[PDB]
Structure 1
Amino acid sequence: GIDHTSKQHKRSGHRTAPKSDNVYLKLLVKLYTFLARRTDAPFNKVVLKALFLSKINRPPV
């Protein structure tokens, strides 16, 4: 067997889609996934990873 350094089968503690069911947020996710995949920019990625956020980590400005 294998002597383990790491906890096995460990999820990354980030979220990769919104827990919401707002279809008009699913769409912007569909959009920024595309613009983060087929682009060399990090602004898109930041926005993507920000759309997933909860209401306390996504506060009013």
Structure 2
Amino acid sequence: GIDLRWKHVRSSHRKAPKSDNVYLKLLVKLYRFLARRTEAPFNKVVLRRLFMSRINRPPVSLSRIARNLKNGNEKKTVVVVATVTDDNRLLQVPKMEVAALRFTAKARARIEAAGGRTLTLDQLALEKPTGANTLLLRGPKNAREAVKHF
């Protein structure tokens, strides 16, 4: 018998999405290939956030994107592995290039009316396969009724 005071620990992290979305499966395959074949930690983080669930992917608003676009980030491509929502309180949408899982109709329309570009994550993988010149953004995780009631 082997004295094992310490216990080998199984992984406490998602290795595959629980979603049955076939397009998400294709995106997971693409970013698995990218994270295996590239140096860039951006691809590994994007593959991780593709694995993540919906409460772990809070939405990001155009006003939050405009806040993070200040101070030398005006030309960086904004990457959000979540839903991008529209904010009525932002009256002037700046020109921006944003890649996301999905946009709302108002957010996409206001970005394209301001003159920016909306991309999907496969278009992002095509144009920036190493994640160069990119601003990676996340929404507020703790802004939830359950988290407030914790």
TM-score when normalising by structure 2: 0.38
Identity %: 78
> How far, CA to CA, are the matches of 2:27 and 2:20 in structure 1?
12
Larger Rg: 2
Which segments of 5 or more consecutive residues in structure 2 lack a partner in the other structure?
A: 61-150
Partner of 1:18: 17
Deviation at 1:7, TM superposition (A): 2.2
Are 1:33 and 2:32 matched, yes or no?
yes
Aligned alpha-carbon RMSD (Å): 1.0
Partner of 1:47: 46
Query: Which runs of at least 4 in structure 1 moved beyond 2 Å after TM superposition?
Result: 5-8
> How far, CA to CA, are the matches of 2:5 and 2:26 in structure 1?
40
Are 1:3 and 2:9 matched, yes or no?
no
Which segments of 5 or more consecutive residues in structure 1 lack a partner in the other structure?
A: none
Number of residue pairs the alignment of both structures matches: 60
**SS at 2:14 equivalent:** coil
> How far, CA to CA, are the matches of 1:6 and 1:13 in structure 2?
17
Deviation at 1:11, TM superposition (A): 1.7
> How far, CA to CA, are the matches of 1:58 and 1:46 in structure 2?
13
Query: Relative CO higher for 1 or 2, CA cutoff 8 Å, sep ≥ 6?
Result: 1
